[PDB]
From a paper:
Acetyl-CoA carboxylases (ACCs) have crucial roles in fatty acid biosynthesis and oxidation and are promising targets for drug discovery against diabetes, cancer and other diseases. The unique central region of ACC, with five domains (AC1–AC5, AC: ACC Central), is located at the sides, far away from the two active sites.
To illuminate the molecular basis for how phosphorylated Ser1157 (pSer1157) is recognized by ScACC, we determined the crystal structure at 2.9 Å resolution of domains AC3–AC5 with Ser1157 fully phosphorylated with our in vitro phosphorylation system. The loop containing pSer1157 is located in a groove at the interface between domains AC4 and AC5, with pSer1157 positioned in an electropositive pocket in domain AC4. To assess the functional importance of this binding site, we created the R1173A/R1260A double mutant and found that its catalytic activity was only mildly inhibited upon treatment with activated SNF1. With domains AC3–AC4 in overlay between the structures of the (phosphorylated) AC3–AC5 and the holoenzyme, the orientation of AC5 differs by a rotation of 40°. Moreover, unphosphorylated Ser1157 in the holoenzyme structure is located in a different pocket, at the AC4–AC5 interface and ~16 Å away from pSer1157, suggesting a large conformational change for the loop containing Ser1157 upon its phosphorylation.
Residue numbers in the entry: 1036 to 1143, 1156 to 1169, 1172 to 1197, 1218 to 1495
Write the structure that this text describes.
Amino acid sequence: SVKERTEQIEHILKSSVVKVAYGSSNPKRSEPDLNILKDLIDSNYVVFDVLLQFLTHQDPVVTAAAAQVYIRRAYRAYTIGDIRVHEGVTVPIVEWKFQLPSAAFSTFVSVSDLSYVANSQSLREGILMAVDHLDDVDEILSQSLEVILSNVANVCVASTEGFESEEEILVRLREILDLNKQELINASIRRITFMFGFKDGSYPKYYTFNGPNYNENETIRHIEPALAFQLELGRLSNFNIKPIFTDNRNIHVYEAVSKTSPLDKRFFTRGIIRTGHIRDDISIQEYLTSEANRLMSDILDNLEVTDTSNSDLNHIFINFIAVFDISPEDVEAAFGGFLERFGKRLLRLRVSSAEIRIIIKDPQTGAPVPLRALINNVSGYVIKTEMYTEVKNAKGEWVFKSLGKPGSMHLRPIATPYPVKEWLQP
Ligand SMILES: [Cl-]
């Protein structure tokens, strides 16, 4: 598939550009047909693993249809405006304008910086720039910013040949930052992101640095900031969070300490399952349960290497991003006995509960419907799985809605931060 989709894309991009029949030559600078690109933007399969390489595609005319797809699919939670394909000193530059609505996503003025609050009255621009190699950046960046804390810059980087440790790429990027610092600031760039594509099907890496001192935002290291909501970080707001980096980049583990009570330590792992290919043979239900399983294995191994000293209510959050043909009952099926298979490992590790998020193609409407399975180890006697949908309530906030008989969180708002151990308060 990684081959097939890598090719599948090429045809879709160039087919968006091409406007004319054989022999007559096509227009030098022409807009791409969004009806034709739409089926690549609104796709349930992964796209970002295979797409970045086409931003430094040879031709500058698909490069721009590549850009749009990226922007238009990263900013699925935003109200996107219009996009201009500019032309820099060297490589092209793409500018999109955008703004965020008030129920954009499950846990509700920006997605990645939850402290960016604005009134009922706010103006937000973004740059996309492709580069070929990290050395290219410094020259490109300053000129690029000129098309002018509220803006956003995403920089793609087609190669890092001649680099070894991340950490040496990190302080390269820090150099590049601290040399353009005041110039980034003048473009009111709130958050800039370097995104390194790949070819064998690995998911891009992401580095993001914020604010006036462009220090790295560790908490959203390998996720496009626009989609960081898939991590649902807001729900950790009663804890001082800190990442623990891992070799699996679909996995974001965080040490949490209740601000209120330094003795309430936990680890929240939040894994993400994008999907690029399902096998013909197997059921959907069968697919959900292997990767869930896989992911929980990879997850458990990291905790069984990390120092989980006085942790207690350790928590796992698996997030599927695709849409699936399956049924709520079949979904619930798949996670029957899900943890039990891990009982001794979850026991030794103090993992008390796990939450899965799946989306279901509605049989009739064909529209996507979000489920949560909340599995709770507590009351150790048995494991209860409570199944919800997500619904907008009276107030306008997304909310759990049980599938059967009311559950623990039957109409709680999905954004509810995990409660703290209060009895540990002085
Ligand atoms: Cl993607």
